[PDB]
Amino acid sequence: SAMDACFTAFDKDSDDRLSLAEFSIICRALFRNDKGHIYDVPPERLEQIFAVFDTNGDGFIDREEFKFCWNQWIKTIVRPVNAFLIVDVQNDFISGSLDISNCSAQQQGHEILEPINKLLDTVDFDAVFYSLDWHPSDHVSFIDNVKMRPMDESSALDSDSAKVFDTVIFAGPPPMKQRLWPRHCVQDSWGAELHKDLKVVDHGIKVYKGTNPEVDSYSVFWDNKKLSDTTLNAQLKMKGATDIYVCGLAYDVCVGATAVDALSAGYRTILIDDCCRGTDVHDIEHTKEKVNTSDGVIVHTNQVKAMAEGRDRRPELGYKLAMELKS
Numbered sequence: 667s668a669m670d671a672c673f674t675a676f677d678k679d680s681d682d683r684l685s686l687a688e689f690s691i692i693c694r695a696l697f698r699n700d701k702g703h704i705y706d707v708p709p710e711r712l713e714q715i716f717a718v719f720d721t722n723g724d725g726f727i728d729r730e731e732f733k734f735c736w737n738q739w740i741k742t743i744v745r746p747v748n749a750f751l752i753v754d755v756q757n758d759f760i761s762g763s764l765d766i767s768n769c770s771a772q773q774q775g776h777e778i779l780e781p782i783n784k785l786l787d788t789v790d791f792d793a794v795f796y797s798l799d800w801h802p803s804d805h806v807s808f809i810d811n812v813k814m815r816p817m818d819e820s821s822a823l824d825s826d827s828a829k830v831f832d833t834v835i836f837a838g839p840p841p842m843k844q845r846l847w848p849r850h851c852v853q854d855s856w857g858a859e860l861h862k863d864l865k866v867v868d869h870g871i872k873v874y875k876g877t878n879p880e881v882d883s884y885s886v887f888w889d890n891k892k893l894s895d896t897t898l899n900a901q902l903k904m905k906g907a908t909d910i911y912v913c914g915l916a917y918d919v920c921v922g923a924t925a926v927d928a929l930s931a932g933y934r935t936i937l938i939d940d941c942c943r944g945t946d947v948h949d950i951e952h953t954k955e956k957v958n959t960s961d962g963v964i965v966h967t968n969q970v971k972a973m974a975e976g977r978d979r980r981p982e983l984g985y986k987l988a989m990e991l992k993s
């Protein structure tokens with residue numbers, strides 16, 4: 667029903683087909699906000715999307731081709747299924763052994779707590795996940811343990827010259843780069859607890875990462891070698907999640923890693939800038955470029971509610987999804 671009605675209303679031609687020109691009008695209906703702005707879609711990208719749904723190449727989208735378009739593209743743009751992913755908002759990264767405010771950029775991690783809690787209070791997400799760095803005491807990422815594991819011949823620094831925040835390269839095939847951190851987020855420790863003032867909503871799901879002594883996992887998805895993953899992706903699929911809102915600590919390390927993996931996994935991905943803090947101004951900007959160049963978007967807390975409710979529908983996310991629907 668509603669669908670044929672939509673197709674009918676944009677088939678100006680009345681020829682039971684959709685030209686590129688009539689499709690461009692669909693896009694202008696889709697990619698706008700409700701504060702009076704219509705987003706600009708480059709004509710090149712316009713045809714890129716169009717060609718996804720013109721599955722035979724006839725230069726038209728007929729009512730048979732449009733089924734795929736309506737069910738799998740238009741419906742997600744107008745009614746996304748939103749997951750909120752709160753990364754590593756843990757004691758050791760705010761006031762303990764790895765207080766981000768002591769890193770180079772001197773940013774204060776406690777400041778993300780207010781806007782995150784406000785989002786949790788005002789936006790009805792379809793799922794909320796909280797990740798926790800969850801390291802065993804013998805974890806490879808600690809300066810404390812650099813002597814436990816043989817170093818690679820490629821590494822500039824060995825167990826006797828390495829200092830906290832240096833990068834070493836461990837042997838054990840394959841060779842493995844690892845930045846060394848103070849002991850942090852050890853399992854069952856105060857430093858691994860979620861910050862006491864972070865709201866843990868009742869439906870919230872905790873995802874534990876970094877548990878293998880031999881490999882780190884900055885990302886809530888795959889570990890740093892992309893060998894093993896958490897069950898986050900499987901849990902997202904069980905919820906029908908289409909869109910992932912990512913925040914937390916640190917912007918340029920775990921948040922960024924998680925956001926890039928979410929894009930790799932195929933999700934429409936939104937990084938909430940002011941709900942994040944990072945360790946280094948230059949690496950934060952490199953993280954932003956990565957997300958932007960892979961068709962994620964970066965937004966402020968105040969934009970999230972209208973996006974999640976489908977009242978502010980961004981064309982970068984529409985393009986992401988059309989490119990993913992190629993396969």
Ligand SMILES: *C(=N)c1cncn1Cc1ccccc1
Binds near residue numbers: 764769919920
């Ligand atoms: C991810 N951000 C992460 C997980 N374990 C260590 N790190 C890096 C880091 C966290 C907090 C502050 C500074 C660096």
Ligand SMILES: [Fe+2]
Binds near residue numbers: 799801807851876
């Ligand atoms: Fe860690």
Ligand SMILES: [Zn+2]
Binds near residue numbers: 721722728731
């Ligand atoms: Zn066609």
